């Protein structure tokens, strides 16, 4: 019957999104044959490479990179130029339009270039082109892995740092993996002398392809786990033989937690510590002001639905389950909590009623039966001697499917089914039909 | 955006070395270029030092050769300049400045006259 | 070596005012053209960087653009403290080449 303000937070299943620099060398090499005055394709290669760390920070430094690449292969240093130029040309990293959603890309070069060769003779011409792109990257809890919206995934937690090797993944070589402390990177990769951000810590690893930089962040600090759901201030709080019952109308459902209370000082609840008092804080300042007292100190409550409540009665760790997605069960138990409320205290209204009705005829009968003792005696006896129907038939419920699995299976344009079976075809045509 | 304030005026005859220090307020950068200059009347700025913000190499190719030595260092990026052989033609206003700080600014500090009189 | 050459070199104006003075130099690209502000005996301070933004604390009364080999900065309305030595320059990585100057100035 006690009343408090609770404040419901739902696992943070959402990715945590940030900013990666991938900075790649593309190697588009263009063959051709030329014969007289009609010049024949030989073909063309594309190959993704990682530029070295020291063209890394000039990148970083002035938003620019070099039009050569370096490569070392059983000891011999291989060097490609771009569009077959050996000097040692700076090139500035200009936007390339598009739109890729949240993929912008800073390339040196727009267009592709490749010149016909001599008559008689095959020519092939170099395209190095130095690629930024501002990829978002999204991890899941743990953080052992992230992985951008291209193609590179990366077994290295986001926020390991050297020093957080026992609280954060790190499946990579440590060869390829770098920390520089109060790193400096353009704001702005589109224009060179752009404004110099200083950062406290970026982490740098050599993909085989490109090369993957972020900044580093506390996990507690911008990767908390619970994410606030709602807040109800009108909440029935209800105990039973194993579980603490939260009834609430303004949402039309109960949650159900453990008899007992996670400790406040958990490290999973450090964000949502301040934050989940701060807003009962102001529902205190809002609804029930004056008139109103807290009652006991802030509570921390698991459901068993994987929620998380934060309770304040006004008059001990977390596990790792997850939410669950479909909330209905909650309804469903505030479509019992209500009627078992109901129904239980419609008999306390009638037994009740009853008892005393019973009662009353009862005295009416104690009299009676030393004037007329022929009632009492079929009342022991309930046989002499000498309301309405009830609609509430068994319906069954059938399974309604609104979308059957045909539908389902065509809700998004993509299917991973058929793009797999369109890559096996692709392979069959370029080596099967041989 | 950064203040990097400079020292006051001094006044030294030539022949023997300058000293100049030049904090870099504002706040603890080491992403800003440096860049010493000096400023006569009847003229402009003309540059002499550009250097890296957490160290100093004195890059100088036409101008003032062995003359000029910047070390500076990390953190606050207190600049420190240097002069050997000063000679009459010196006598001017010694800049010290970022090159950019945000959205192309090229801050520079208060400025310290180098002026022989009595 | 690359040429600088900002115009008019000399020139007089009343107050309020608008004002066109342009600079003109034979860079390769646009690179970033800011323009500056001095008065005498104190130290330089810039007005616009990157023909598209100005310096935070200079009100809105000055303009910038530029076409082809040309730039020029604007000026709404000049006022008492507007007089004084205006500088244009190019900055790529650390090289730096600096202009002239106008000089602003009243009767």
């Known amino acids: 019957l006690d009343e408090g303000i609770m404040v419901v937070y739902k696992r943070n299943i959402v990715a945590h999104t940030f900013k990666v620099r991938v900075y790649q060398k593309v190697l588009t090499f263009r063959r051709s044959y030329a014969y007289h005055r009609t010049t024949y394709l030989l073909g063309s290669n594309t190959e993704y490479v990682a530029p070295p760390m020291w063209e890394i920070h000039h990148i970083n430094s002035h938003s620019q990179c070099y039009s050569s690449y370096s490569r070392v292969i059983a000891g011999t240093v291989f060097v490609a130029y771009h569009r077959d130029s050996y000097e040692n040309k700076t090139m500035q990293l200009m936007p390339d339009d598009y739109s890729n959603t949240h993929s912008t890309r800073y390339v040196t070069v727009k267009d592709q270039w490749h010149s016909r060769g001599s008559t008689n003779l095959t020519r092939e011409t170099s395209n190095l082109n130095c690629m930024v792109t501002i990829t978002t990257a999204r991890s899941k809890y743990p953080y052992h892995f992230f992985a951008t919206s291209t193609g590179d995934v990366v077994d290295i937690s986001p926020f390991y740092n050297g020093t957080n090797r026992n609280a954060s993944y790190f499946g990579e070589n440590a060869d390829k993996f770098f920390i520089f402390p109060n790193y400096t990177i353009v704001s702005d990769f589109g224009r060179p002398n752009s404004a110099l951000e200083t950062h406290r810590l970026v982490a740098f690893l050599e993909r085989a392809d490109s090369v993957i930089s972020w900044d580093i962040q506390d996990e507690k600090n911008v990767t908390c786990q619970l994410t606030f759901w709602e807040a109800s201030e009108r909440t029935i709080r209800s105990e039973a033989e194993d579980s603490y019952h939260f009834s609430s109308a303004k949402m039309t459902a109960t949650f159900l937690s453990k008899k007992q209370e996670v400790n406040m000082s958990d490290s999973a609840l450090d964000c949502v510590r301040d934050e989940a008092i701060n807003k009962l804080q102001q529902i205190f300042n809002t609804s029930y002001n004056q008139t109103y007292e807290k009652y006991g100190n802030v509570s921390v409550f698991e459901t068993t639905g994987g929620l998380v409540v934060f309770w304040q009665g006004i008059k001990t760790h977390l596990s790792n389950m997850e939410s669950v997605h479909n909330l209905v069960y909650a309804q469903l138990q505030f479509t019992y909590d209500t009627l078992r409320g109901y129904i239980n205290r419609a008999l306390a209204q009638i037994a009740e009623a009853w008892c005393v009705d019973q009662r009353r005829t009862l005295e009416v009968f104690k009299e009676l039966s030393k004037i007329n003792p022929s009632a009492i005696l079929s009342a022991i006896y309930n046989k002499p001697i000498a309301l309405d129907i009830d609609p509430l038939e068994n319906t069954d419920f059938r399974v309604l499917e609104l979308y059957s699995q045909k539908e389902l299976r065509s809700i998004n344009v993509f299917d991973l089914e058929e793009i797999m079976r369109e890559f096996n075809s692709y392979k069959q045509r370029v080596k099967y039909v041989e | 955006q950064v203040q990097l304030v400079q020292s006051g005026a001094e006044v030294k005859k030539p022949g023997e070395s300058l000293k100049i220090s030049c904090k870099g307020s504002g706040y603890t950068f080491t992403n800003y270029w440096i860049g010493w200059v000096r400023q006569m009347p009847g003229a402009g700025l003309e540059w002499m030092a550009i250097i890296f913000p957490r160290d100093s190499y004195s890059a100088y190719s036409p101008s003032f050769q062995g003359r000029v030595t910047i070390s500076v260092d990390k953190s606050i990026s207190t600049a420190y300049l240097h002069w050997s052989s000063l000679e009459a033609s010196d006598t001017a206003v010694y800049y010290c400045?970022?090159?950019?700080?945000?959205?192309?600014?090229?801050?520079w500090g208060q400025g310290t006259p180098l002026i022989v009189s009595s | 070596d690359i040429q600088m050459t900002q115009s008019p070199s000399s020139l007089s104006a009343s107050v309020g005012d608008r004002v066109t003075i342009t600079c003109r130099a034979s860079?390769?690209?646009?690179?970033?053209l800011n323009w500056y502000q001095q008065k005498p005996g104190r130290a330089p301070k810039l007005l616009i960087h990157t023909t598209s933004t100005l310096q935070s604390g200079v009100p809105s009364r000055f303009s910038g653009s530029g076409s082809g080999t040309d730039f020029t900065l604007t000026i709404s309305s000049l006022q008492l403290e507007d007089f004084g030595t205006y500088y244009c320059?190019?900055?790529?990585?650390?090289?730096?080449?600096f202009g002239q100057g106008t000089k602003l100035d009243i009767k």
């Open positions: 320059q190019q900055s790529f990585s650390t090289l730096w080449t």
């Open positions: 400045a970022i090159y950019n700080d945000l959205r192309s600014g090229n801050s």
């Open positions: 860079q390769s690209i646009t690179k970033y």
